[PDB]
């Protein structure tokens, strides 16, 4: 009779039921369908997985084993759809990508 959660029924590692809870008493709608938390959970799965991929490659690119917010900042700002989505948010302790204008160089 005992069966496990809906997250592995959908094959996901994020909690489906917690997302369903937050959608229920988040007063967005008076009635919430069954398939909505699964879809939202899968979208959050792919977004978090892609952000962790870019952060892991950034941390490999600096020869470290830990995720610094510099790695998150360079991974977000280097890539362009993450630039468009996250243009208006300032990452805490992120810094600024190096850029020099061509006319400001010592051209000679």
């Amino acid at each position: 009779k005992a069966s496990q959660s809906r997250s592995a029924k959908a094959g996901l590692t994020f909690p489906v039921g917690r997302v369903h809870r937050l959608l229920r008493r988040g007063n967005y709608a008076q009635r919430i369908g069954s398939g909505a938390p699964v879809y939202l959970t899968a979208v959050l799965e792919y977004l978090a997985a892609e952000i962790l991929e870019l952060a892991g490659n950034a941390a490999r690119d600096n020869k470290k084993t830990r995720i610094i917010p510099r790695h998150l900042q360079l991974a977000i700002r280097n890539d362009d759809e993450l630039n468009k989505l996250l243009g208006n948010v300032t990452i805490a302790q992120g810094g600024v990508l190096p850029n020099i204008h061509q006319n400001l160089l010592p051209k000679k």
């Binding site: 950034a58 690119d61 360079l74 280097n78 190096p98 020099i100 061509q102």
Partner: protein
């Protein structure tokens, strides 16, 4: 040469009336209430008197008369009155019933019938195999109270055609009926159809025309005009055939030697200037002296410029991929430039993104290639591209002319559309095909083992009949014969029958039943049986339906 299609031409002459002097109050009337057409006539004739599509429409006029009697063949008069026609059939069943009364009144008016207290003639009627009880009770109610006929008979049109082609009434054979909305395989033993083993496939001519419409709209999403149902119907009729072997015809249909035949087409400065003039004069002298060597050098330069431009285009295409190793190398270079010299400053300057400068460099390289081509003159094909072969056939295509911008090609669809009755999975129906249903009827049923056929199975194989309106597609009989030889044991004789026109065999069937034999009276239901047994009464005769339970 592209052939243009249009709407079918309209009937100029109106449909005629039967004479009043030919009225016999005791003669019956045979009515085939098909989904696509209606066939009505008196019993004593051999050919049905009235053929028209089973549709009607309402007409509105400015004079406020509301004349709405455009029924059947009357709709084949104007384009506006034809497009608003509506059939009583929604799917395989009849949903609305006032239009059925109007259609029956129209055909009773055109049959030369003068009634009194209802119609005084018995009625021959067909019905769908294993129909629902509500259709039967409502048919009983309308035919016994609205029109008050003395006698009513029910049956299946495939069984009626089988009785037509063996009027002894006790033969044994196999009936395959390809109708408008469904396909049935009905086994017959001793003249009585064994309805416990008949099978039905939910596919017909209507689904085939809709499948052709969906396929052809998927093939050309930017078609300028919109084509009606009748245009898809007539190019389904004229350009479709059943292949002898689909699994070999698919692998060679798009080759060049096959597409040419069976593809149808349906519609300081002065010193620099003096140096440039001297270089031009030297080039002219070299062209006048050694034209072949200068032509070879210019062709080699054009080839080198084309190779460099191809490498630049390959690099530009590879730079767009985010998951490519060049993008990972660019990310590593950005991380190294962040990690950190004139060389480093030059690398940081040259590591900048320049898409517009890449387009300008491509334009300059194209100009240099054009200059090399002009120097060679002075001194990507569609054969191997299967998408162009599927789209525009074996001829080159240009998009600037309006004649072939309204042009359609039918190459794969000619065998793809009639193949769904053999593989219903292509149409989305999870059912077995015609050949597998015939195999499991003849081989794993009726006291027959695989490898040992009984006498009933041999008599069934020797008397296979194909009927229905959808038997007009060529190549059906040969394919059925080939598959039947495929699964049967060796030495078995297979005989198939097919009419010259298999649409009208059901009308000849009930004409021969009501005329030639007096055993038509065995199946006749009267007033008293309806009144004492109720509408849920079924006569278990040899040509109609049976009781739902055991």
């Amino acid at each position: 040469k592209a052939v243009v299609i249009d709407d079918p031409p309209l009937r100029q002459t109106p449909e005629p009336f039967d004479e009043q002097s030919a009225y016999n109050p005791q003669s019956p009337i045979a009515i085939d209430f098909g989904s696509s057409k209606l066939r009505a006539g008196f019993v004593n004739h051999a050919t049905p008197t009235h053929i028209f599509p089973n549709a009607l429409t309402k007409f509105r006029d400015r004079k406020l008369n509301k004349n709405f009697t455009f029924v059947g063949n009357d709709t084949l008069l104007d384009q506006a009155v034809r497009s608003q026609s509506r059939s009583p059939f929604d799917g395989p069943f009849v949903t609305n019933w006032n239009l059925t009364e109007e259609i029956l009144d129209y055909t009773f008016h055109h049959l030369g019938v003068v009634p009194d207290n209802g119609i005084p003639n018995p009625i021959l009627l067909t019905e769908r195999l294993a129909t629902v009880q509500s259709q039967r009770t409502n048919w009983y109610q309308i035919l016994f109270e609205t029109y008050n006929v003395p006698g009513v008979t029910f049956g299946i049109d495939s069984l009626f055609s089988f009785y037509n082609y063996n009027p002894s009434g006790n033969k044994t054979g196999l009936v395959i009926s390809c109708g408008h909305e469904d396909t049935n395989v009905i086994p017959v033993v001793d003249g009585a159809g064994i309805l416990t083993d008949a099978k039905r496939i939910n596919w017909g001519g209507h689904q085939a025309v809709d499948y052709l419409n969906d396929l052809m709209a998927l093939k050309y999403p930017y078609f300028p005009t919109k084509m009606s149902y009748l245009q898809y119907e007539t190019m389904y009729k004229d350009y479709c055939y059943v292949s002898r072997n689909y699994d070999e015809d698919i692998e060679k249909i798009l080759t060049l030697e096959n597409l040419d035949t069976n593809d149808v087409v349906v519609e300081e400065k002065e010193r620099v200037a003096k140096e440039e003039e001297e270089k031009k004069l030297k080039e002219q002298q070299w062209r006048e002296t050694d034209l072949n060597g200068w032509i070879k050098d210019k062709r080699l330069k054009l080839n080198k410029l084309i190779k460099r431009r191809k490498e630049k285009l390959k690099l530009r295409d590879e730079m767009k991929d985010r998951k490519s190793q060049v993008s990972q190398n660019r990310m590593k270079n950005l991380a190294s430039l962040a990690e950190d010299n004139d060389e480093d400053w030059l690398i940081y300057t040259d590591i900048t993104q320049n898409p517009e400068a890449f387009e300008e460099a491509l334009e300059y390289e194209y100009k240099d290639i054009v200059e090399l081509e002009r120097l060679l003159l002075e001194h990507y094909d569609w054969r191997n591209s299967i998408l162009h072969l599927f789209l525009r056939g074996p001829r080159p295509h240009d998009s600037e002319n309006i004649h072939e911008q309204h042009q359609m090609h039918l190459n794969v669809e000619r065998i793809r559309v009639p193949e769904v009755i053999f593989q219903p999975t292509m149409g989305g129906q999870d059912q077995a095909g015609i050949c597998e249903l015939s195999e499991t009827i003849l081989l794993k049923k009726f006291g027959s083992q695989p490898g040992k056929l009984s006498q009933t199975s041999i008599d069934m194989v020797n008397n296979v009949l194909i009927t229905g309106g959808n038997a007009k597609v060529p190549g059906l009989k040969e394919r059925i014969v080939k598959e039947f030889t495929g699964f049967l044991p060796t030495g078995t004789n297979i005989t198939v029958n097919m009419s010259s026109d298999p649409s009208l065999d059901a009308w000849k069937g009930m004409a021969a039943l009501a005329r030639n034999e007096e055993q038509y009276r065995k199946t006749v239901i009267s007033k008293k049986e309806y009144e004492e047994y109720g509408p849920e009464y079924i006569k278990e005769h040899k040509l109609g339906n049976t009781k739902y339970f055991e």
